[PDB]
Amino acid sequence: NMDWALFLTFLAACGAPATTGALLKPDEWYDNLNKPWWNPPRWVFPLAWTSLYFLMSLAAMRVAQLEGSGQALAFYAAQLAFNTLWTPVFFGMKRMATALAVVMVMWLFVAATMWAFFQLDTWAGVLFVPYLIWATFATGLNFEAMRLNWNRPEAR
């Protein structure tokens, strides 16, 4: 059920958030921050995001072939935009509290996309489960970055 035009369009759309990561690698401002005890090493993040961009694009390709896809793809557009927004807010401007709001809104749209995907295609919904899990970890990391660095002005 492989529609390559659809899949490559969704993958190309992931070039926008992928670009935020390439142009805003965490520096020692990030390394100096107090990390939660469960903080993963740096190499985990490019692995996780590359896999998720491929998985969410495959899921979107499947759903976009189905009747009644409209609302699910609207949710998909929404989560992707806030996904693109997060890195410049946290790593570019160091607005940690605003970034927490961003990742929480993204989380809601990721959950809505996954739910809407399950309504139309079980596999597309399953492909989004690791994304919702990873988005949960991202929200916790954003929260812990603020709670463990509250004496920094950029955390408040």
Place this chain on the structure above:
Amino acid sequence: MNMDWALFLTFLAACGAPATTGALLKPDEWYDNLNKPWWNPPRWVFPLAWTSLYFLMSLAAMRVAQLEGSGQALAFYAAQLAFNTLWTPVFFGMKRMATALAVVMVMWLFVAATMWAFFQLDTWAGVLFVPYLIWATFATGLNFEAMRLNWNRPEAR
């Protein structure tokens, strides 16, 4: 084909992400120093124009999302919105004028693709995107002239 509020509000909420990039822009002395073309509008014009476009593009997507075969058009729509969200941090936040030109040109291509695919399904949704493509052409020209008219420092390799 109706005014579908779940669809429309979802697409409008999605434009909250690029709207946020604009909202977090403090007045910049580097931007005020830049040589601008005579046809550069004052700064207050941009949030007004983008707000109108967010409503226009969201209404267009709402109409298309109700139609069979919308998939490719909606995929184009997701792409244009994502690169739209990318542009402001690249130009104003990181001050990477050349990379921002590439971003806005990619956005332009996906805006053109969305409008074309929208026209294939619904003329009015395509019409609603025409002022967006016009604005995107104007935005690309401003990025091009800003780079052409000023000193540019090297970007980090």
